[PDB]
Short mmCIF file of C-alpha atoms and ligand atoms in Angstrom, two decimals:
data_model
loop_
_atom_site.label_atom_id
_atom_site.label_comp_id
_atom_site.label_asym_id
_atom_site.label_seq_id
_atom_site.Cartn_x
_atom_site.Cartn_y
_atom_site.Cartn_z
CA UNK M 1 -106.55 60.96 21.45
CA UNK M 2 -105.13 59.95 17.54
CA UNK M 3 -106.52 61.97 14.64
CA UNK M 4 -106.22 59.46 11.93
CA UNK M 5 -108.33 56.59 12.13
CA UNK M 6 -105.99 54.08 11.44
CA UNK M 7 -104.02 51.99 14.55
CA UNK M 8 -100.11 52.68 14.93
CA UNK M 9 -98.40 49.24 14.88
CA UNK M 10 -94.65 49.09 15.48
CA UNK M 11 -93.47 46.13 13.62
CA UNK M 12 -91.37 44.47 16.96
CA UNK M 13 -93.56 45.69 19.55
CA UNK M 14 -95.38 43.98 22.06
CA UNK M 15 -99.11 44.09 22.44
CA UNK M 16 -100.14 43.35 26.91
CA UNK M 17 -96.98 41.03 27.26
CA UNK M 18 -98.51 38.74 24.53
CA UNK M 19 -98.84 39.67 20.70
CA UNK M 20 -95.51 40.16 19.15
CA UNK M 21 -96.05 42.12 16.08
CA UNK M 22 -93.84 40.91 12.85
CA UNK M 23 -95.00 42.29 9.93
CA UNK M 24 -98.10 43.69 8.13
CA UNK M 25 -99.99 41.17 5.66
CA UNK M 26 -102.44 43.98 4.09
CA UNK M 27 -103.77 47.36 4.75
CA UNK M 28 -107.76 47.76 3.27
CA UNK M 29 -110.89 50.43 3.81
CA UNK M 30 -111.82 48.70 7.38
CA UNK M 31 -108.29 48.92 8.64
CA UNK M 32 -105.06 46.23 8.69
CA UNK M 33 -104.80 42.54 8.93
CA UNK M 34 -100.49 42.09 11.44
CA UNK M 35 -98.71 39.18 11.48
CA UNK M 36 -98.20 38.29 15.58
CA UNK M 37 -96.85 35.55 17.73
CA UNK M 38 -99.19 34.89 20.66
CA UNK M 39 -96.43 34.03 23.03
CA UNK M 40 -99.09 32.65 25.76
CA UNK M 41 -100.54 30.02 23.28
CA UNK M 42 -97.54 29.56 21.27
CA UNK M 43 -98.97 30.34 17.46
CA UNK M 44 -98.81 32.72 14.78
CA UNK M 45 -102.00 34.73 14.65
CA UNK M 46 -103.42 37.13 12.12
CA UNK M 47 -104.84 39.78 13.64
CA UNK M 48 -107.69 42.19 11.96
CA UNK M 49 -107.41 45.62 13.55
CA UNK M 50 -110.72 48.15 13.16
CA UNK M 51 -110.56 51.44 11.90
CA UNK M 52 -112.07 53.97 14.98
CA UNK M 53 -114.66 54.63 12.06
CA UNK M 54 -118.23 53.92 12.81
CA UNK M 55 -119.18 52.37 9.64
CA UNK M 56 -116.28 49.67 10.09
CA UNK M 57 -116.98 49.16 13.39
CA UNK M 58 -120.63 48.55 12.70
CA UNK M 59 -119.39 45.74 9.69
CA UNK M 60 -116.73 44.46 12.75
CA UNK M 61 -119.45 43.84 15.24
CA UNK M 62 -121.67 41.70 12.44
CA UNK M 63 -118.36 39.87 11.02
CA UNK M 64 -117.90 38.91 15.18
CA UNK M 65 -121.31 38.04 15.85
CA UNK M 66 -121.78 35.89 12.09
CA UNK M 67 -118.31 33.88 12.97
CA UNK M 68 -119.23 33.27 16.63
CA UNK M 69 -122.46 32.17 15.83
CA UNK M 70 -120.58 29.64 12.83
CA UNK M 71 -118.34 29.01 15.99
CA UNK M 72 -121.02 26.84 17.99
CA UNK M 73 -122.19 24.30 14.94
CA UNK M 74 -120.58 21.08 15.71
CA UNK M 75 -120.03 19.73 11.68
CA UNK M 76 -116.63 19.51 10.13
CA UNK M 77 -118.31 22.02 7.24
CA UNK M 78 -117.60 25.28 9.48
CA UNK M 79 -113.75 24.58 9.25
CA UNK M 80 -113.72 26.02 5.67
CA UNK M 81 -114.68 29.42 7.20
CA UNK M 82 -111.61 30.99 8.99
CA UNK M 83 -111.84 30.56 12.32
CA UNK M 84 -111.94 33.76 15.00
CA UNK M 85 -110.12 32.93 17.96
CA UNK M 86 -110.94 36.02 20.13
CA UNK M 87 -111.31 39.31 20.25
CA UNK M 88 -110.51 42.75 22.14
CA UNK M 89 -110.31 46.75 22.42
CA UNK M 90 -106.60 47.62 22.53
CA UNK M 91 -105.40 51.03 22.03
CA UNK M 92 -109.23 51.87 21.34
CA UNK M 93 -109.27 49.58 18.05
CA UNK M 94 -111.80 46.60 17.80
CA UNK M 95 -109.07 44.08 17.31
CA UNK M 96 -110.28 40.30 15.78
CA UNK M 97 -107.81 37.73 16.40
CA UNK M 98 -107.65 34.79 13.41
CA UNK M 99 -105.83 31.25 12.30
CA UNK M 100 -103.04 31.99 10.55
CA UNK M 101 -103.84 31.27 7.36
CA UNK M 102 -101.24 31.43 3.77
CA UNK M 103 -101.63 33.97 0.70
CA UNK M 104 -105.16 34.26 -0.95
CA UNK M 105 -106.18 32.72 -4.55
CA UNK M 106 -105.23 35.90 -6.43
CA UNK M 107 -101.39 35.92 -5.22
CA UNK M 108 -101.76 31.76 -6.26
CA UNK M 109 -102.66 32.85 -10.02
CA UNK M 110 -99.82 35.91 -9.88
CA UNK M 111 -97.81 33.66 -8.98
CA UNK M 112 -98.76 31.03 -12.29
CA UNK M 113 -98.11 34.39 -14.51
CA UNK M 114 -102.07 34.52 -14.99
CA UNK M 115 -101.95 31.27 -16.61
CA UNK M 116 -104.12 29.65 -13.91
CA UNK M 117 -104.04 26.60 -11.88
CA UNK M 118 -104.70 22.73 -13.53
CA UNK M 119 -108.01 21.94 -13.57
CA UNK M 120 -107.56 18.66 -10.90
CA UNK M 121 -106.64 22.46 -8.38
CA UNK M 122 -109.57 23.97 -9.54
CA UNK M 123 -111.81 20.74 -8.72
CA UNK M 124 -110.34 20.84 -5.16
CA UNK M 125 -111.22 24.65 -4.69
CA UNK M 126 -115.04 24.19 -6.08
CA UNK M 127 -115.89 21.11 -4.01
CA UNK M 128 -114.31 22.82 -0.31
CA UNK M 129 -116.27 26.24 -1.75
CA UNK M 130 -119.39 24.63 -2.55
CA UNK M 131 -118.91 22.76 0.76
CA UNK M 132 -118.38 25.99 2.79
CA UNK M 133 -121.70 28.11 1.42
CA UNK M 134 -123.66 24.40 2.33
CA UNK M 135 -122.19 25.23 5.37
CA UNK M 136 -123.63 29.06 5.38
CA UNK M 137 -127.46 27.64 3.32
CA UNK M 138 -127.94 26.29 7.28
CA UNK M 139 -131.02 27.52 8.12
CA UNK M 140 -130.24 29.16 11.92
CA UNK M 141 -126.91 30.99 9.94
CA UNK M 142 -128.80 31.56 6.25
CA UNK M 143 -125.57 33.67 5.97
CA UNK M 144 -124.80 35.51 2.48
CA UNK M 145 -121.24 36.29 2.19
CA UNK M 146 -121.91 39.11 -0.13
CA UNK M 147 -117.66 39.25 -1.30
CA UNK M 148 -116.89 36.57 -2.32
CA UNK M 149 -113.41 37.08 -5.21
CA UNK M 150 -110.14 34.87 -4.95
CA UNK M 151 -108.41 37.69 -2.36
CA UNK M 152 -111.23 36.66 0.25
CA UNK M 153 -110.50 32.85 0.07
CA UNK M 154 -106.67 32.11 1.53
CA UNK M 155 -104.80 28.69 1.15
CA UNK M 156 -104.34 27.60 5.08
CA UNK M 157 -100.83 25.74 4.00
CA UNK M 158 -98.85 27.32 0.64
CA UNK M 159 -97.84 23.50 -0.24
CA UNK M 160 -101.70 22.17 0.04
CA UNK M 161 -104.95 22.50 -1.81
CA UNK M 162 -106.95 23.16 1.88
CA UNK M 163 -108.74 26.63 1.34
CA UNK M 164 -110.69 29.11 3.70
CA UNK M 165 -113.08 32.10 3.28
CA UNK M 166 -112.30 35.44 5.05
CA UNK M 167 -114.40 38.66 5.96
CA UNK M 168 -117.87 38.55 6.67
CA UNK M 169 -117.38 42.49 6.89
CA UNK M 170 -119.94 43.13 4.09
CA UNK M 171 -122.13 40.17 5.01
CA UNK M 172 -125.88 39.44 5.93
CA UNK M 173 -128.35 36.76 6.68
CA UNK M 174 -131.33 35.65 4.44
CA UNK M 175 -134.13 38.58 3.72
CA UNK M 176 -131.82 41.21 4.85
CA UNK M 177 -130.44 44.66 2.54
CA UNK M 178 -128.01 46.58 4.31
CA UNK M 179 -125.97 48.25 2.18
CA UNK M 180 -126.45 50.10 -1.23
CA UNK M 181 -123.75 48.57 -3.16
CA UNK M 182 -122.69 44.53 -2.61
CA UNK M 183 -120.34 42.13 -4.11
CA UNK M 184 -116.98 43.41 -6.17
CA UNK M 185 -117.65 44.14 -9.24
CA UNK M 186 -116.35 41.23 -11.66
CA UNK M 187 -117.94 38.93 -9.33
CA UNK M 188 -121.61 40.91 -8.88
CA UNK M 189 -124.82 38.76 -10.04
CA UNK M 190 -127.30 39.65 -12.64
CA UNK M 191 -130.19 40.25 -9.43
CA UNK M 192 -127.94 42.74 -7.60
CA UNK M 193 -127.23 44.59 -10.82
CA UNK M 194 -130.60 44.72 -11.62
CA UNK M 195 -131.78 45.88 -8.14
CA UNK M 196 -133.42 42.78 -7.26
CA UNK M 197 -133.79 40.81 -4.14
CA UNK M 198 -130.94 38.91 -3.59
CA UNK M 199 -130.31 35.46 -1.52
CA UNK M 200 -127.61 33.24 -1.25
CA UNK M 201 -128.17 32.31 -4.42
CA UNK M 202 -125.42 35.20 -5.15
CA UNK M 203 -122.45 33.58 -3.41
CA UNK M 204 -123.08 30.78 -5.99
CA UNK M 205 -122.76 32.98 -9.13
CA UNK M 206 -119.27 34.70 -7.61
CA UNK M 207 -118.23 31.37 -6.90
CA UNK M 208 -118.93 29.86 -10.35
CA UNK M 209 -117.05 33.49 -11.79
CA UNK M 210 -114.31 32.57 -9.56
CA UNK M 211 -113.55 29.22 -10.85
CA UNK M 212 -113.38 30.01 -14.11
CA UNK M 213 -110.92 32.57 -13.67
CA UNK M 214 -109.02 30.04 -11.13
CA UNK M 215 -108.38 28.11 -14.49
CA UNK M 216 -108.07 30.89 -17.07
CA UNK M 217 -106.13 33.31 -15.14
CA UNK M 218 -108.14 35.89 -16.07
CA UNK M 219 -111.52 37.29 -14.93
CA UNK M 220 -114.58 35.92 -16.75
CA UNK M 221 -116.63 39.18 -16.52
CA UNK M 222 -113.95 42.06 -16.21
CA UNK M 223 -116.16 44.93 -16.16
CA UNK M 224 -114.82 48.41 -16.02
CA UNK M 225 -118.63 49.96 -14.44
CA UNK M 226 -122.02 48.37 -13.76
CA UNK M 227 -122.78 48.91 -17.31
CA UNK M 228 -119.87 47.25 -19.03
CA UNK M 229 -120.33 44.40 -15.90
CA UNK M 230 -123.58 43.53 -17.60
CA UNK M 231 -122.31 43.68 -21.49
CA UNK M 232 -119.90 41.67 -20.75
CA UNK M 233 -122.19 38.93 -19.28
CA UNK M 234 -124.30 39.26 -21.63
CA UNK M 235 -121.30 38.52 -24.16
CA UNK M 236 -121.18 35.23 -22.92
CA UNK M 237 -124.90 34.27 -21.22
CA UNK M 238 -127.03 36.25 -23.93
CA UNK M 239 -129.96 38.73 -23.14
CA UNK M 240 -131.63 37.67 -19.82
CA UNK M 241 -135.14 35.94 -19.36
CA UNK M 242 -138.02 38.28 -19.71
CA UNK M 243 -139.33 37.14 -16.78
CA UNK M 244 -136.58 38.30 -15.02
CA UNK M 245 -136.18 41.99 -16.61
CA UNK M 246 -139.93 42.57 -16.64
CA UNK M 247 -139.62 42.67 -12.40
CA UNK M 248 -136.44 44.22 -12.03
CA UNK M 249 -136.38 48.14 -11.19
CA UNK M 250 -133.23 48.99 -12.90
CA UNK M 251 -133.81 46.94 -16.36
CA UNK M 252 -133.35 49.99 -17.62
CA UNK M 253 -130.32 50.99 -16.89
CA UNK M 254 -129.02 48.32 -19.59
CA UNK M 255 -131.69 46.79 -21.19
CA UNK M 256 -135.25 48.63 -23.49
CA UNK M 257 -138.39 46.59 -24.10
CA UNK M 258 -139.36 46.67 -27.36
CA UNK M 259 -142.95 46.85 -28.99
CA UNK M 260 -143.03 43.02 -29.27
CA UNK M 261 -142.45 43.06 -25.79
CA UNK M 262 -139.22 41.32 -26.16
CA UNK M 263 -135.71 42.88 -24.51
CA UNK M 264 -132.38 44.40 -26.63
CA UNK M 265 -129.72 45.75 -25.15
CA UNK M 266 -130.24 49.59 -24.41
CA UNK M 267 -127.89 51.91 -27.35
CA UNK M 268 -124.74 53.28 -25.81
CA UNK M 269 -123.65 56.99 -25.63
CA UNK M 270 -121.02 56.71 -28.92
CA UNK M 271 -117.99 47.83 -29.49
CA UNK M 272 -119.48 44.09 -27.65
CA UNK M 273 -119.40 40.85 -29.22
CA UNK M 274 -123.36 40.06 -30.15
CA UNK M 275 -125.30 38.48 -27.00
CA UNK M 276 -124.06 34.72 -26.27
CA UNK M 277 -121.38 34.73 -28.93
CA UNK M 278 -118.71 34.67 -26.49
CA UNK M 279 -119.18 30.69 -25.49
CA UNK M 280 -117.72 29.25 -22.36
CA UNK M 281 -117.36 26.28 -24.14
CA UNK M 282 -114.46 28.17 -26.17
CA UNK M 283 -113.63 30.40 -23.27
CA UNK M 284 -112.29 27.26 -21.04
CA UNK M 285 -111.13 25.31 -24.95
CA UNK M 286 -113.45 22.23 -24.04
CA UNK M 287 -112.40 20.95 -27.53
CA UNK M 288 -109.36 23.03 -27.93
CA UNK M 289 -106.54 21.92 -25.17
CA UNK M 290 -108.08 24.34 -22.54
CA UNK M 291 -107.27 27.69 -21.71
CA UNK M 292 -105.21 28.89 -24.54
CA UNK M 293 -104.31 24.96 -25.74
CA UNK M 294 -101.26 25.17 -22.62
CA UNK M 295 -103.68 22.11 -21.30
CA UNK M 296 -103.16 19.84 -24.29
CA UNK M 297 -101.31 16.43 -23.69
CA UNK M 298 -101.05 17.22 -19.45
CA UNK M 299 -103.25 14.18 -17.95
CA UNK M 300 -106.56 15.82 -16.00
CA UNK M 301 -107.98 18.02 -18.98
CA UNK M 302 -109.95 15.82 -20.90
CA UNK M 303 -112.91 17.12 -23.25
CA UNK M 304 -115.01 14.62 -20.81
CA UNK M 305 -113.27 16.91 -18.14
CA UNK M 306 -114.00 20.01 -19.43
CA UNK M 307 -117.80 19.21 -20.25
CA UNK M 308 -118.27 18.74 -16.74
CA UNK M 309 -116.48 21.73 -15.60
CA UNK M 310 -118.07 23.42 -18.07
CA UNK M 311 -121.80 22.23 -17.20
CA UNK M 312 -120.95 23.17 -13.90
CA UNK M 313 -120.23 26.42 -14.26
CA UNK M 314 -123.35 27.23 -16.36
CA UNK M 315 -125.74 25.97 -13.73
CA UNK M 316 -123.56 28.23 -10.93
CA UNK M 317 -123.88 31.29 -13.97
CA UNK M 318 -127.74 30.83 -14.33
CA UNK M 319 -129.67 34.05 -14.17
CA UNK M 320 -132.17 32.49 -12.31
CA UNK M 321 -131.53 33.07 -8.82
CA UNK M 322 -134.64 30.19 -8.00
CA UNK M 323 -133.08 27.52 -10.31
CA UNK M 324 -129.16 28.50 -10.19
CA UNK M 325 -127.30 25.88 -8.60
CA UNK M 326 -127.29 25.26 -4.75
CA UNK M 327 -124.47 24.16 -3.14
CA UNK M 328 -126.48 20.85 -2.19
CA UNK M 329 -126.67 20.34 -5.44
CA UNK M 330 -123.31 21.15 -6.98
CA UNK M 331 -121.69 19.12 -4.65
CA UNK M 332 -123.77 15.89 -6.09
CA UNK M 333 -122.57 17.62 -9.93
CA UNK M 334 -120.37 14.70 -11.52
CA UNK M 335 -117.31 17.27 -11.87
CA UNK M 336 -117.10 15.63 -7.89
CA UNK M 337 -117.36 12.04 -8.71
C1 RKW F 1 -107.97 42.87 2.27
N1 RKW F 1 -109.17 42.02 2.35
C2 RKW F 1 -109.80 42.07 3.68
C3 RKW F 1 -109.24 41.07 4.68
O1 RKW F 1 -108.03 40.83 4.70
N2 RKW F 1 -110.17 40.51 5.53
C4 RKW F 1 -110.03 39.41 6.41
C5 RKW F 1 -108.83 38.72 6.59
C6 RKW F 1 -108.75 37.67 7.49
C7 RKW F 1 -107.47 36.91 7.60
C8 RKW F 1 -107.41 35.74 8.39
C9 RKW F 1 -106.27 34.96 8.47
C10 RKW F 1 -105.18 35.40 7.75
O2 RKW F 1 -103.95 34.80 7.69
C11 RKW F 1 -103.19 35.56 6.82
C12 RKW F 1 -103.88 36.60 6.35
C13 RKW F 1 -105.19 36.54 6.96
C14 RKW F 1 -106.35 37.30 6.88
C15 RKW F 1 -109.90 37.30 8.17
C16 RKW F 1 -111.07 38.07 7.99
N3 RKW F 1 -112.19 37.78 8.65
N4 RKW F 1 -111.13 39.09 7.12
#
């Protein structure tokens, strides 16, 4: 019986006369993702392998039952969720067997130096994203991704536009709070932050993060801790509705109510540029040739362009959760037309 928790995988082996084992794609806190032929059905798989760790087994056993149950809907939506083919103990590891799919949307921008993709790219991504979490808003799934960030959303070809979301690891359905700590960090809502109840409405504000930063290159809200995450939205989205602060338990941790009632930003220890100073408007260079003026005179990237994009992203980056965007919505937004 092994000590570590990990699986031993022999790039070249054999896996029950089936699975030849290539290469490893990545190695994370749940386990590994191997490249495999599956000899019987003639295909290159991906296949997850479990830690023998309780905790990641528990997360396994919801990602299996969350993808089977997207598995049985009939609609041409579920295909831009990647699609489990089976699964199995082998070498006592819970072992999840996936589509090959291509590199993720953080090896695309790497790959453009950090200069991001055109904005005609970015269009594609939003409208199959906003597609998939219509696709997750169903009422019998009502599934909230809870991860969403460009390294769990993989191009399916590396010469086409066609995108997919992986890892439903740290997911949950509608009414549910499972774990203590959800979504990365650059890509965490105001309601989470502020130990709110959270819906799907979350997915929405990491996917409007996301696309920015598909464009840019760069992460909209880079924060180093929970405290900085918030500054640094704040930068851009000013102080947050009273309405909002005034219910949340941990308002505190970043914001003080003042005698008038109305909210500040809480003093630091002993640096931010003032509340809603930092404009998307200049962040994406609506008027200004786009992201650093590299956009000006390419075709695609016109002000009328931008304003869209830009509108767009605002209602995705509302701090409402009950009038943010839904993905019903979005999809009608004229960024799509
Ligand atoms: C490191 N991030 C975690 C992670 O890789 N999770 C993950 C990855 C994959 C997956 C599926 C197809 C793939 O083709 C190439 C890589 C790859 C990964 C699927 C699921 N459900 N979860």
């Amino acid at each position: 019986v092994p000590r570590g928790s990990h699986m031993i995988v022999k790039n070249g082996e054999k896996w029950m006369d089936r699975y030849e084992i290539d290469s490893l794609i990545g190695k994370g806190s749940f386990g590994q993702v191997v490249k495999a032929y599956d000899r019987v059905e003639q295909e290159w798989v991906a296949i997850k392998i479990i830690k023998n760790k309780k905790a990641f087994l528990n997360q396994a056993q919801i990602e299996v039952r969350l993808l089977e149950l997207m598995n049985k809907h009939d609609t041409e939506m579920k295909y831009y969720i990647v699609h489990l083919k089976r699964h199995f103990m082998f070498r006592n590891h819970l072992c999840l067997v996936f589509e090959m799919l291509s590199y993720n949307l953080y090896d695309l921008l790497r790959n453009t130096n950090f200069r991001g993709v055109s904005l005609n790219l970015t269009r594609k991504f939003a409208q199959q994203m906003c597609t998939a979490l219509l696709f997750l808003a169903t009422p019998e799934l009502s599934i909230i991704h809870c991860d969403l960030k460009p390294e769990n959303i993989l191009l399916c070809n590396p010469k086409r536009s066609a995108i997919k979301i992986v890892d439903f690891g740290s997911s949950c359905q509608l009414g549910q709070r499972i774990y203590q700590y959800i979504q990365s960090r650059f890509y965490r809502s105001p309601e989470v932050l502020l130990g709110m109840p959270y819906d799907l409405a979350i997915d929405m504000w990491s996917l409007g993060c996301i696309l920015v930063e598909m464009h840019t290159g760069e992460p909209l809200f880079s924060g180093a801790n929970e405290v900085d995450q918030m500054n640094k939205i704040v930068e851009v989205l000013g102080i947050p509705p009273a309405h909002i602060l005034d219910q949340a338990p941990k308002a505190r941790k970043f914001f003080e109510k003042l005698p008038d009632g109305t909210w500040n930003l809480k003093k630091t220890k002993d640096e931010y540029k003032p509340p809603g100073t930092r404009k998307l408007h200049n962040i994406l260079g609506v008027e200004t040739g786009g992201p650093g003026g590299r956009r000006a005179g390419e075709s695609g990237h016109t002000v009328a362009d931008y304003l869209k994009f830009k509108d767009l992203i605002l209602r995705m980056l509302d701090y409402d959760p009950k009038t943010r965007i839904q993905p019903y919505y979005a999809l009608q937004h004229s960024f799509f037309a």
